Structures are given as C-alpha cells and as structure tokens.
Design an enzyme around this catalytic site. Structure first.
Site, mmCIF file in Angstrom:
data_model
loop_
_atom_site.group_PDB
_atom_site.id
_atom_site.type_symbol
_atom_site.label_atom_id
_atom_site.label_comp_id
_atom_site.label_asym_id
_atom_site.label_seq_id
_atom_site.Cartn_x
_atom_site.Cartn_y
_atom_site.Cartn_z
ATOM 1 N N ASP A 35 -52.462 35.145 20.072
ATOM 2 C CA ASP A 35 -52.128 36.065 20.782
ATOM 3 C C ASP A 35 -51.747 37.370 19.933
ATOM 4 O OD1 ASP A 35 -51.322 38.027 22.783
ATOM 5 O OD2 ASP A 35 -49.571 36.567 22.865
ATOM 6 N N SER A 199 -58.829 54.851 21.903
ATOM 7 C CA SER A 199 -60.135 54.538 22.495
ATOM 8 C C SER A 199 -60.386 56.222 22.735
ATOM 9 C CB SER A 199 -60.481 53.771 23.618
ATOM 10 O OG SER A 199 -61.596 54.140 24.096
#
EC number: 3.4.23.22
Length: 330
Positions: A35, A199
């Site tokens: 994770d 992004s």
C-alpha cells in the site's frame, strides 16, 4: 541488494493485489496488500481477536526465534475507506522477493474491522508511503522500504500491476524490459506523507487532451481512480445511460456499454487506461447495472491515482533524497 516479488489480484475484478512476504524465523509467509498510501506493516496474528479472524493466515510471534516485542509500542490506523485495525508491535526479520530487512517493525493486530475479517485473501498490509505517516506510538517506526533503502542498489521500488493478471513489485532496480518507451519522471511532495504529484491533464476516449493540473497520490492500496467531479462528469457523459447513484455510492453504467479509455498526463507524456480497466462489474450479482472505476474524489479531500490508473503503467517510486515518481507505458 534487490528484491522481486509477484503480486496477484485477489479476485476477478482486481479489487486489490497480494504479495507474499516472509516474516520471522523460520519464515512465516503471509500475503500482504502493498500500500503506497499508508506506512504501517501490520498482520493478522495469534493475538487477533479470534472472532475477527476468518480464513486469514496469521503471524505467530512466539514461533519466531527472531521476534522481539517492541515494549510499550502500540498502533492504530483508520483507512480512507472507513476500515481500521490496531494492536501491538514486534520487530522481526521480513523478506520480500529475496530482499531481507532485519529489525522490521511488524505490527500485530489485536483488533481489525469487519472489512478485513471479511476478506480472507488479505493477511495484512505492507505500507510504502513515507514513514512520517507510521502510526506506531510512542516511537514511530520505519517502513520496509525505508529500512531497506541504504542496502538497495538504487533507492527505488517499482509497481507493475496487472490487469486481470499477476504483476511485479521490484526493490532496488528498474527492469528496463518491463515497459515500453521512456519513463517520465515528475515531482513529488511528501508534505502529507504520500507519493503526491501533479498530473498535467486528461482526455476521454479519442477526445482532445485537456491541460489542467490535477494534484493526487499514487496509491496502490486504493482500487479505483478518484478525480475531481468535473473530470469524472466529463468521462461518464460519454457513456450512454451512465449516472451517479447516491444509493449505490457513485457512478454506475449499463453493463451493455463499451467504455471509452481515459488518458492522464505525466508531464508531456500520456498514460492510457483502456476502457475495460474501468469496468468493475455488476453492482450486485445478476444486476445489469455496473460499477464505474472512475469516481469523484469530492468529499475524500484528495485525488487518488489508485490501481485503475497505476495498472496501466510501469511506476517508479524513487526514494532518492528528493523523491520523484516515474511513469511509463507498458
């Protein structure tokens, strides 16, 4: 040193991935959920409330000659999906894919929430976010990657998750045969303890690319792709009959639909998520309403590049002094 381990979807939907981890002496092998959105290595154990164990493999510290109780130490964590767990702490030897750390904090669960009990395939989590998020008290502990870092050939690990298929986590090296083209690297903020990046935009299907900054985290522990409501609305508007359902808890679509791809930007590069990756199947057995793999982050408080996004790429988690993230197509 290096390590290399295969990571396997737990079910037909890729809801999560498990990776075998050797703990203790002799080895006890547990299948953990790697994770990159948390920083605790915790396991079902011989100490876990018996009514909360249902099919998981447990770590039994008393059977490990290298286990040592970390005196006074406790842990307690709550995840973004509402699940939780807590317990006490041992140090022990932990190996992943041939890479060994001695004195790793292994957090032994005394309590786990129903979500964990109900998932027989996951024996615990292995956190790979930054150690600043580790919940051990009163002495915060380091992640497996942090402990291994100085020994690795290069201070990196890579996630290569499969679509409906096994993939690979590598530690200490970049497998140049595992991706196509070049790896594009992008800046990381560690201020929130996550692999947080920005992004450069998105496209829906064959649509034109929208340049826009989207702050989010690369999180292998989250199944879906969580983005701003504007983006998510633009995606599902291209699917006939798709709608946001409050009763279901997100966007659903007719199972008879063909989903468009979703492209996200990494600097000047582009990662394409095929439409099939965005199908998470009937909301309930036999239903013709299917659950979407792109969902709104509104009310999460952060955008999450979960497995839906990450499995479309070869992803480098670069833990150099100044961390960065790299993405390549594959």
């Amino acid at each position: 040193s290096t390590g290399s381990a295969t990571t396997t979807p737990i079910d037909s939907l890729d809801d999560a991935y498990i990776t075998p981890v050797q703990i203790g002496t002799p080895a006890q092998t547990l299948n953990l959920d790697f994770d990159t959105g948390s920083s605790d290595l915790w396991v079902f154990s011989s100490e876990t409330t018996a009514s909360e164990v249902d099919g998981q493999t447990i770590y039994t510290p008393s059977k490990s000659t290298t286990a040592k109780l970390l005196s006074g130490a406790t842990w307690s964590i709550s995840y973004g999906d509402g699940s939780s767990s807590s317990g006490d702490v041992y140090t022990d030897t932990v190996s992943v894919g041939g890479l060994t750390v001695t004195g790793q904090a292994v957090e032994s669960a005394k309590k786990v929430s129903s979500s964990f009990t109900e998932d027989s395939t996951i024996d615990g989590l292995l956190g790979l976010a930054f150690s600043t998020l580790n919940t051990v008290s009163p002495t915060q502990q380091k992640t497996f990657f942090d402990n291994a870092k100085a020994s690795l050939d290069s201070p990196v690990f890579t996630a290569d998750l499969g679509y409906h298929a096994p993939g690979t986590y590598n530690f200490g090296f970049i497998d140049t045969t595992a991706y196509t083209g070049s790896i594009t690297y992008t800046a990381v903020s560690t201020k929130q303890g996550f692999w947080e990046w920005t992004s450069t935009g998105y496209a829906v299907g064959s649509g034109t690319f929208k340049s826009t900054s989207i702050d989010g985290i690369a999180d292998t522990g989250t199944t879906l792709l969580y983005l701003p409501a504007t983006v998510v609305s633009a995606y599902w508007a291209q699917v006939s009959g798709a709608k946001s359902s409050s009763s279901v808890g997100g966007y659903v679509f007719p199972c008879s639909a063909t989903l468009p791809s979703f492209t996200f930007g990494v600097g000047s590069a582009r990662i394409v998520i095929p439409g099939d990756y965005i199908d998470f199947g009937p909301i309930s057995t036999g239903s013709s309403s299917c659950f979407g793999g792109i969902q709104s982050s509104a009310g999460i408080g952060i955008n999450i590049f979960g497995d839906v996004a990450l499995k479309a790429a070869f992803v480098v988690f670069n833990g150099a002094t100044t961390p960065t993230l790299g993405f390549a197509s594959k």
